[PDB]
Amino acid sequence: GRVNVGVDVGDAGSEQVATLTITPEKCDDKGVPVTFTFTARPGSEAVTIEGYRVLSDRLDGVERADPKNPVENAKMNLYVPSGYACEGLTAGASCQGNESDIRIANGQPVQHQIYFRVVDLEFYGFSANNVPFTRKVTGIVS
Amino acid sequence: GRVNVGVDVGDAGSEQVATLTITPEKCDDKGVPVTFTFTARPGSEAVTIEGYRVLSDRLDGVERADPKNPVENAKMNLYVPSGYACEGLTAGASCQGNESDIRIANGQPVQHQIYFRVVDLEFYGFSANNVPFTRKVTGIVS
Amino acid sequence: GRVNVGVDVGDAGSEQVATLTITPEKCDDKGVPVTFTFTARPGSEAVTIEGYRVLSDRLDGVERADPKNPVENAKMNLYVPSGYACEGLTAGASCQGNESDIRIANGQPVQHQIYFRVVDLEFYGFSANNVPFTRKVTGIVS
Amino acid sequence: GRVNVGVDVGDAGSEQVATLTITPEKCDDKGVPVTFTFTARPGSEAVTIEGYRVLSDRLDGVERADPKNPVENAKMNLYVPSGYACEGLTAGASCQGNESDIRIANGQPVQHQIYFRVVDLEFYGFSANNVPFTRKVTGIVS
Amino acid sequence: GRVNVGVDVGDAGSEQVATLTITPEKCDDKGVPVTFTFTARPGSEAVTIEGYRVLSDRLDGVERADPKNPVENAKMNLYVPSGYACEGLTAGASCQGNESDIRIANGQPVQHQIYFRVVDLEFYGFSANNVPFTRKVTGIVS
Amino acid sequence: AATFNPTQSFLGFNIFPTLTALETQGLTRRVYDGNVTMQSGQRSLSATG
Secondary structure, three states, X not given: OOOXXXXXXXXXXXXXXXXXXXXXXXXXXXXXXXXXXXXEOOOOOOEEEEEEEEOOEEEOOEEOOOOOOOEEOOOOOEEEOOOEEOOOOOOOXXXXXXXXXXXXXXXXXXXXXXXXXXXXXXXXXXXXXXXXXXXXXXXXEO | XXXXXXXEOOOOOOOOOOOOOOOOOOXXXXXXXXXXXXXXXXXXXXXXXXXXXXXOEEEOXXXXXXXXXXXXXXXXXXXXXXXEEOOOOOOOOOOOOOOXXXXXXXXXXXXXXXXXXXXXXXXXXXXXXXXXXXXXXXXXEO | OOOOEEEEOOOOOOOOOXXXXXXXOOOOOOOOOEEEEEEEOOOOOOEEEXXXXXXXXXXXXXXXXXXXXXXXXXXXXXXXXXXXXXXXXXXXXXXXXOXXXXXXXXXXXXXXXXXXXXXXXXXXXXXXXOOXXXXXXXXXXX | OOOOEEEEOOOOOOOOOOOOOOOOOOOOOOOOOEEEEEEEOOOOOOEEEEEEEEOOEEEXXXXXXXXXXXXXXXXXXXXXXXXXXXXXXXXXXXXXXXOOOOEEOOOOOEEEEEOOOEEOOXXXXXXXXXXXXXXXXXXXXX | OOOOEEEEOOOOOOOOOOOOOOOOOOOOOOOOOEEEEEEEOOOOOXXXXXXXXXXXXXXXXXXXXXXXXXXXXXXXXXXXXXXXXXXXXXXXXXOOOOOOOOEEOOOOOEEEEEOOOEEOOEEEEEEOOOOEEEEEOOOEEO | OOOOOOOOOOOOOOOOOOOOOOOXXXXXXXXXXXXXXXXXXXXXXXXXX
C-alpha cells in the first residue's frame, strides 16, 4: 500500500493591493483565496486530509514561526479518491479494486481554499487503510 | 461496532467587522455562521448528535470558561448516516447492512450552523446501538 | 413498548432587538419564533404531544417560576410518526408494524412554533398505546 | 521508455505598458499571462510536471539570477497525456498501450499560465514509470 | 522519406501607421500580425516546427543582423500533417500510410502569427522520422 | 508478423509480453463386485412383460 497525492497551489490573486499613494479620485488628491487542488497519482490509495501545520512563516524574510510549536489546524474533512478508474465509480468515491475493468489513472481533483509572506504548509490525514499521511506544500506566497 | 465521524468546520465569515475609524460616508467624517459538516468514515455506524459542550473559551487569550461547569447545549437532533453504500439507500437514511451489494464508503454530509475568540467544542450523542459518543472540534475561531 | 423522540430547537432569531440608542434616521438624532422539530428514534412508538409545562423561567437569572404551580399549556395536537419505514406509508402516518418490509428508521419530522430569558419546557402526551409521555427541552434561550 | 514533450509558449501580451509621457486625457496634460502549451510527441510516455526552476534571469541584460541557488517552484500538478490514440481514451487520460487499435499521435494539449526581462525556465516532474524529467523553455520574454 | 512544406506569408496589415502630420481632429491642428500558413505537399511526411532563426534584418536597408549570432526562437510546437488523404483522418492528425484508400494530397493548413523592415526567417523542426528540417521564408516586409 | 512503416518512427523500444501456463491431472476409478447364486442346469426365465 502506497499513498501518492499531488497538489496544484495557484498562488495568484492572494495579496490585497494597497500601495497606491495616488487615488481613483479626480487626480491623486482625495482617496489617499489560494485554491489547493489535490489529485491522487495512479496506483495510489484513497486518503482523507484532516488539517495542516504551518512549519515556516516568513513575512518579508523574518522567521516568525517558532517551529517548536507550529500552528495546527484540524478543521478539514477532504476526501481524495483512490486514483483508479472503473465502470461503477460515482462522483466522489473510490473503486473497490477488483472490477476486472479497473485501470490506474489520476484521481478526481478535489479543492480547498485557505485565504491568507511565504508559508510552508504540511497537510496531514489518513489513508484508506487508516495510516498517517503527510504532504508538504512549501513555497506558497502571500 | 465502531463510530468514526469527521467534521469540516469552515470558520470563515464568522467575525463581525467594526474596526473602521474611517467611514463609508463622503470622506471619513460622519459614520464613525460557521457551517459544520459531519460525514461518517467508511465502516462506521450511524450516529445522532444531541448537543455540544464548550470546554474552552478564550477571548484574546483569557480562559473565561470555568471547565468545572461547561456550557451545555441540548438542542440538536442531527443524524449522520452509517457510512456504507447500497442500492435502496434513500436521501437521509442508513443501509441495513446485509444488502449483498453493500460497500464501505463515506456517509452523506449533514450540516449544522452555530453563529458565534477561539472555542473548543465537543459534540455528543449516541450511535445506532445507543452508546454514548463524543467528538472534539477544538480550534474554531470567532 | 418504548418511546424515544428527539427535538431540534433552533432558538435563533427569537429575541426582539431594541438596544439602539442611535437610530436609522439621518445621524443618531431622531429615532431614539423558535421552531421545535420532533423526530422519533428508530424502534420507537408513535406519540401525540398535547401541551407543555414551563418548569423554570429565568429572566436575566431570577427564578420567576414558582415550581409548585407551573404554567401548563393544553393547546397542542401534534402527531410524531412511529419511527419505522415501509412501502404503504403515507405522509403523516405510522406503519402498522407487520409489513414484512418494515425497517427501523427515523420518523418524519413534525414542527411546532412557540414565539417567546431561558425557559425549561417539558412536553407531554400519550403514545400509540395510550401511556403518558414527558420530554424535557431544557435550555432554550429567549 | 522515452519522454518527449514539446511546448508552445506564446509570450505576447506579457509586458505592462507604461511608457506614455502623454495621456489619454484631453491633450497630453493631466494623466502623466504567458500561456504554456505542453503536448507529447508520438511514441512518448505520459508525464506530470511538478514545478519549474528559473536558471537565468536578465532584466535589460543583467544576470540577476545567482545560478548556485535557483528559484524553485513546487506548485504544479499538470498531466501530459501519453501521445497515443485509441478508442476508449477519455478527455485527460492516457491509453493503456495494448488496445490493438492504438496509434502513435500527438497528445492532448494541456496549458499552464505564469504571469511575469528574459527568463530561462526548466520544468521538472516524473513520467508514467516514475523517472525524473526536465524540459528547458529558454528564451521567454517579459 | 522526403519533407516538402510550403508557406503563404500574407504580410499585409503589418506596419503601424504614424506618418500623419495632419490630424483626425478638427482641421490638422491638434492631434499632431503576419499570418504564416504552412501546408504539406503531396507525398510529404509530417513535420513539427520548433522555432525560427532571423538570418537577415534590414531596416530601411541596413544589415543590423550579425549573421554570426542569429536571433533564435524556441517557442513553437506546430504540427504540419503529412499530406495524404484517407477515411479515418481526424482534424489535426496524419494518415498511417497503409489505408488501402490513401492518396497523396495537400495537407491541412496550420497557421502561426508573428507580430513584427524586411526580415529573412528560417523555420526549423523535425519530421515524423525525427530528422532535422529547415524552411526559409525570406522576403517578409515589416 | 513483422511490418515496416517508412512514414513514422517509434520512440525507443517496447516489448509488451504476455505469458500463459497451465497444468492438469485427473483420475477416475469405478469398481463393481457382483455375486449370484445359481444351479448347474439352470434355465432362463421368460417373463419379459
